[PDB]
Amino acid sequence: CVKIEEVIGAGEVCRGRLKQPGRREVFVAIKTLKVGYTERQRRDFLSEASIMGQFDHPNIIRLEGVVTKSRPVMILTEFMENCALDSFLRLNDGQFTVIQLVGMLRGIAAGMKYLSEMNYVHRDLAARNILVNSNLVCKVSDFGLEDDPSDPTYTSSLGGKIPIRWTAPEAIAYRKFTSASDVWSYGIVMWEVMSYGERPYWDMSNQDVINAVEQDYRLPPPMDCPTALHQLMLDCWVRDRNLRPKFSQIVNTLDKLIRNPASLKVI
Ligand SMILES: *CC(=O)c1ccc2c(Nc3ccccc3)ncnc2c1
Numbered sequence: 001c002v003k004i005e006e007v008i009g010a011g012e013v014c015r016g017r018l019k020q021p022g023r024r025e026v027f028v029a030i031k032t033l034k035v036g037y038t039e040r041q042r043r044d045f046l047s048e049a050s051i052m053g054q055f056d057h058p059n060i061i062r063l064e065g066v067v068t069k070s071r072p073v074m075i076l077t078e079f080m081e082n083c084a085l086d087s088f089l090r091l092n093d094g095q096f097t098v099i100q101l102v103g104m105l106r107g108i109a110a111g112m113k114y115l116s117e118m119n120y121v122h123r124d125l126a127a128r129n130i131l132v133n134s135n136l137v138c139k140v141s142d143f144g145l146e147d148d149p150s151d152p153t154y155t156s157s158l159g160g161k162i163p164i165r166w167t168a169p170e171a172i173a174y175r176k177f178t179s180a181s182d183v184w185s186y187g188i189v190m191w192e193v194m195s196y197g198e199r200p201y202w203d204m205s206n207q208d209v210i211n212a213v214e215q216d217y218r219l220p221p222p223m224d225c226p227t228a229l230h231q232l233m234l235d236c237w238v239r240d241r242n243l244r245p246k247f248s249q250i251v252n253t254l255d256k257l258i259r260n261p262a263s264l265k266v267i
Contacts, residue, residue: 015079063077085130107139116182122142125189194229
């Protein structure tokens with residue numbers, strides 16, 4: 001049933017084909033586990049496959065199937081042509097209209113609205129975890145495939161790795177991970193999108209980021225970013241987590257900007 005085609009990255013992420021008795025052949029992404037898999041590693045990989053299988057939404061990565069009967073174990077998903085959002089934007093620097101970028105952000109927010117409705121807290125919302133297809137539809141993902149190892153994207157923190165640049169201050173400080181801390185991460189995703197995949201906080205060290213945020217520093221609007229979009233980022237980054245908009249309100253605000261495109265001209 002599963003046929004491999006080419007290796008993408010390093011277990012490993014590969015491209016291939018899948019055929020089931022009743023449905024037509026579709027291109028798939030195959031997440032494999034490294035040779036000589038441990039009982040705990042196999043349990044962690046399958047518990048991740050079980051999470052993805054619970055969801056069904058046009059802005060959430062679709063799980064096509066899972067291989068359990070034969071080694072190596074596999075996670076099969078629908079192949080997303082344009083790969084990760086951050087890498088896709090960096091090579092397409094200034095090649096999209098504001099409306100297209102807003103549509104991408106609306107898709108991400110619709111996916112996040114669905115997750116929050118299912119009572120699921122993502123914890124790692126970032127442009128590197130958003131996949132893009134040929135039609136520019138953005139899909140929220142996780143458990144898939146480094147600018148400076150001195151200021152790593154993830155910090156080895158006791159219980160688990162934390163991406164400091166994308167994490168709400170209360171989730172860094174007290175591990176208070178909620179849909180509101182995912183909204184903070186979404187605000188960082190908005191900034192990554194409007195900047196065509198720049199590194200949040202630039203040269204600032206990871207410790208500088210925590211200190212600056214605590215002292216009310218907020219990322220400036222990227223070049224040519226409409227004021228309304230930046231204001232929405234600032235709303236996502238309220239220190240009071242109760243005042244941050246819900247994903248349903250973000251979707252509503254983005255739709256209001258799409259209906260009134262003149263508001264996307266004000267820079
Ligand atoms: C285009 C490209 O490089 C790419 C990379 C990874 C993908 C994934 N990853 C994934 C597989 C299994 C579980 C979670 C994420 N899925 C779909 N398309 C791509 C495309």
